[PDB]
Design a protein around this ligand. Structure first.
Ligand SMILES: OC[C@H]1O[C@@H](O[C@H]2[C@H](O)[C@@H](O)[C@@H](O)O[C@@H]2CO)[C@H](O)[C@@H](O)[C@H]1O
Length: 143
């Protein structure tokens, strides 16, 4: 899109207008819930079902804190990329930004490069962003 989605309720699912295109920046601005309450996810997916998630970005406040990055294809999860030293904390606001590049998603958190996730499926087929889990959202916006 862009009008942004303002104060969207979680779980959230919404259209990305024109789908993912090279150069598109998707901001997810919100706060990790203080409750107990150990994971949240941002999914760049095709349609409503969640069977085809080009990029599942999944902070887990477990086993020291880590982020799982993965792709689901016709209902099947791939091999996980896991990143430690995660820049999310329970009760802490965040500005999470996804940049679509030709080769990857570049993910910035609070203005700092966090992870790159190389495309496993074509990114243009992504037409929907969904967010679920232990998070509240101030806005999701698009540049
Ligand atoms: O890979 C993303 C999905 O992970 C699923 O859980 C994994 C788990 O991370 C891994 O340790 C292994 O044991 O298998 C599971 C795959 O079913 C979550 O259930 C799912 O929500 C995604 O996060």
């Amino acid at each position: 899109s862009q009008a942004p989605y303002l104060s969207p309720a979680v779980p959230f699912s919404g259209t990305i207008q024109g789908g993912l295109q090279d150069g598109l920046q998707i901001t997810v601005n919100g706060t990790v819930l203080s409750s107990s309450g150990t994971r949240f996810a941002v999914n760049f997916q095709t349609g409503f079902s969640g069977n085809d998630i080009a990029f599942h970005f999944n902070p887990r406040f477990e086993d020291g804190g880590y982020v799982v990055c993965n792709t689901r294809q016709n209902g099947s999860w791939g091999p996980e990329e896991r990143k430690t030293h995660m820049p999310f904390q329970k009760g802490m606001p965040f500005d999470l930004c996804f940049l679509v590049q030709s080769s990857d998603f570049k993910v910035m958190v609070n203005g700092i490069l966090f992870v790159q996730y190389f495309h496993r499926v074509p990114f243009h087929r992504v037409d929907t962003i969904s967010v679920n889990g232990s998070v509240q959202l101030s806005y999701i916006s698009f540049q």
